[PDB]
């Protein structure tokens, strides 16, 4: 995608994350955890279901049209009828081909983008207490128990609590 997160600086996806599209995976003194991020997940799902709804329910309500199958050829009038239908079919075939290609190119970009927005959100919460490792992971330069990790995930983490400890560790 355009942002280079999915199939980019995030090397791969997580099969074990089964209740979200995006999430957190941590490691602290007392263990490891994998939790889903609802907001990011929901943002991606809403945008994709949106595409689906706009698509499913066209309106193509047609009754009396033209003859489209013929036993024997008749010449001029029949040729026009066949040419008209054949032109219609190619134009609609082209439309469907382009549509799916555009939609899929965009869907991939949206999902890559939502991944990046999650990463950038967490980067900003951390301020000067963490450093980007380069694989979608932050090294946190202070002791961070389970309540601390959770405070990061639910967005209540207050960087000022740990900044002294963190600045010390980073630069000394």
């Amino acid at each position: 995608g355009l942002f280079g997160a999915i199939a980019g600086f995030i090397e791969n996806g997580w099969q074990g994350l089964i209740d979200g599209w995006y999430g957190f995976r941590h490691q602290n003194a007392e263990g490891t955890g994998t939790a889903a991020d609802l907001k990011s997940t929901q943002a991606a799902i809403d945008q994709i279901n949106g595409k689906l709804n706009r698509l499913i329910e066209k309106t193509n309500d047609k009754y009396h049209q033209i003859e489209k199958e013929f036993e024997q050829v008749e010449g001029r009038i029949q040729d026009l009828e066949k040419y008209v239908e054949d032109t219609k079919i190619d134009l609609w075939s082209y439309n469907a081909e382009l549509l799916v290609a555009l939609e899929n190119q965009h869907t991939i970009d949206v999902t890559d983008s939502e991944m990046n927005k999650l990463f950038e959100r967490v980067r900003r919460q951390l301020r000067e207490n963490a450093e980007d490792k380069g694989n979608g992971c932050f090294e946190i330069f202070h002791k961070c128990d389970n309540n601390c990790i959770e405070s990061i995930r639910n967005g209540t983490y207050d960087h000022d609590i740990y900044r002294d400890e963190a600045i010390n560790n980073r630069f000394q």
């Binding site: 996806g13 698509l55 489209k68 079919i89 799916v100 999902t111 890559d112 979608g136």
Partner: protein, 319 residues
């Protein structure tokens, strides 16, 4: 200073290939097929009103051939015409066949209104043995065969019906084509014969044709059928020094014509679906279908491709 928090995304073992602008093989976590390539083996009679012509094609239904009585009074969204329909009457041709077929189909109903034409010295209700409606020689029940007097007199006949009604009428009439000059005057006065149906806008004129025509029918002659539409405030005049397969009335025309015809051998079933192809009904929410270009109702759009997968998930990169 070494706890670590990692941001990531989901994945599954095996995803689905989709196309983009740049790549025709990208694996995403989920995808949705947009081309319907499955149909039901039957036609759904709901919610669209389908009328099964069975043994009658729609032209024979309107003429009133033997075995087409079930089509009387019938109203349809889609007339379902069978590929193995059978001619069961006096052999005919319709000069603008596809155009008459189109008008009947689009009109959507068989509502015949009888009115009687005071014909002169001539006999009425002539019948035939190639049109044997149940056990006896008969004719198209909407048409009336006129033949000589008991005194070899067929006077020039000019009758007229006036449309003061609030709808346009459809009159279907015919012209007989004998094989010989003796067959020609054996059931009719002159040679040549002729029919001339006029409105105040139009005039249509036919003189019969006499000759060796090929035989099954068991017979050598034919009828050529024509129609005239008489708008509210218009008139129709039948003149004939011979050969007229005269009408017994007129069909009611809807002002709005929104029906159509579908030609297929598919049986009508019990399902529900507003979309019919000649291969059978479709029951789908998909936007496209590759089943048949012949499609009627509320349908997906026909396309050439057999599959178009829409990505509904992110790229799948497992492990």
């Amino acid at each position: 200073g070494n706890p670590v928090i990692c941001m990531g995304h989901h994945a599954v073992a095996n995803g689905t290939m989709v196309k983009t602008l740049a790549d025709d093989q990208v694996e995403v976590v989920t995808a949705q097929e947009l081309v319907e390539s499955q149909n039901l083996p039957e036609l759904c009679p709901s919610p669209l009103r389908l009328v099964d012509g069975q043994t009658c094609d729609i032209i024979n239904g309107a003429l009133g051939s033997p075995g087409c009585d079930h089509l009387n009074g019938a109203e349809w969204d889609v007339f379902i015409e069978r590929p193995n329909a059978v001619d069961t009457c006096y052999p005919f041709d319709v000069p603008e066949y596809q155009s008459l077929r189109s008008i009947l189909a689009n009109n959507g109903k068989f509502e015949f209104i009888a009115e009687e034409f005071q014909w002169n010295t001539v006999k009425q209700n002539g019948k035939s043995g190639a049109c044997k409606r149940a056990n006896v020689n008969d004719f198209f029940n909407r048409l009336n065969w006129l033949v000589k007097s008991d005194g070899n007199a067929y006077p020039l006949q000019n009758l007229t019906k006036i449309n003061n009604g609030d709808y346009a009428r459809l009159y279907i009439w015919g012209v007989h084509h004998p094989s010989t000059d003796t067959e020609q005057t054996n059931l009719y006065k002159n040679n040549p014969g002729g029919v001339t149906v006029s409105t105040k806008t139009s005039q249509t004129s036919v003189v019969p044709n006499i000759g060796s025509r090929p035989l099954v029918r068991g017979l050598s002659s034919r009828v050529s059928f024509y129609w005239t539409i008489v708008e509210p405030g218009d008139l129709i005049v039948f003149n004939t020094i011979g050969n007229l397969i005269a009408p017994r009335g007129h069909y009611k025309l809807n002002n709005q014509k929104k029906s159509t015809i579908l030609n297929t051998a598919i049986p009508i079933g019990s399902c529900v679906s507003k979309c019919h192809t000649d291969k059978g009904s479709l029951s789908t929410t998909k936007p496209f279908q590759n089943i048949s270009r012949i499609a009627v109702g509320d349908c997906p759009r026909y396309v050439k491709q057999g599959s178009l997968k829409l990505a509904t998930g992110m790229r799948n990169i497992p492990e």
